[PDB]
Amino acid sequence: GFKQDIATLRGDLRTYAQDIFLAFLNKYPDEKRNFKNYVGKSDQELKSMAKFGDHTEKVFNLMMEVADRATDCVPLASDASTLVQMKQHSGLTTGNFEKLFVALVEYMRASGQSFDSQSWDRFGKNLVSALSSAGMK
Ligand code: HEM
Numbered sequence: 001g002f003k004q005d006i007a008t009l010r011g012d013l014r015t016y017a018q019d020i021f022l023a024f025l026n027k028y029p030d031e032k033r034n035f036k037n038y039v040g041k042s043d044q045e046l047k048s049m050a051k052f053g054d055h056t057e058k059v060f061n062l063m064m065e066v067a068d069r070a071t072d073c074v075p076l077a078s079d080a081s082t083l084v085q086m087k088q089h090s091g092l093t094t095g096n097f098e099k100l101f102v103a104l105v106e107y108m109r110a111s112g113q114s115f116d117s118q119s120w121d122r123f124g125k126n127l128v129s130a131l132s133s134a135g136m137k
């Protein structure tokens with residue numbers, strides 16, 4: 001289920017984080033705007049941009065903590081505020097997070113693994129809702 005999935009992802013987090021974030025940027029190429037340095041780069045190229053591996057892993061480190069502290073795929077309001085109140089998310093809307101979670105769920109669906117993809121989809125919905133409530137537009 002969801003908790004085991006957090007363990008699975010954490011066991012190879014660098015690899016999952018890159019592959020899911022790349023799935024996100026390739027499904028929604030306009031989202032590369034948020035990361036100028038990423039434009040005109042193949043996946044392999046991105047995977048050798050220091051900022052890429054480090055921002056991606058830090059995104060997934062914190063996403064797995066927020067997932068771990070959730071009850072029934074509902075994140076802590078305190079975690080939602082943090083994501084809203086981060087200066088680097090100033091430009092962001094819940095739409096940015098929507099699309100990340102659509103790509104993550106689709107990645108899990110297409111994987112050969114028994115990810116609880118329905119739980120991740122509810123998690124993404126609930127986090128978007130929490131982000132709105134915490135003041136993201
Ligand atoms: C659960 C979802 C997310 C988490 C946990 C998260 C977490 C983080 C963290 C921890 C940082 C700081 C990393 C660092 O610079 O050292 C960061 C930076 C940033 N995040 Fe997010 N993030 C999430 C979703 C998003 C989404 C959906 C976007 C855009 C569509 C985004 C855009 C950015 C940008 C642009 C930066 C700074 C730019 C850079 O990488 O140099 N984040 N995020």
Ligand SMILES: C=C(C)[C@H]1CC=C(C)CC1
Nearest residue numbers: 021035051052055056059
């Ligand atoms: C495109 C990727 C991997 C970005 C994810 C999050 C941050 C903060 C920058 C790298």
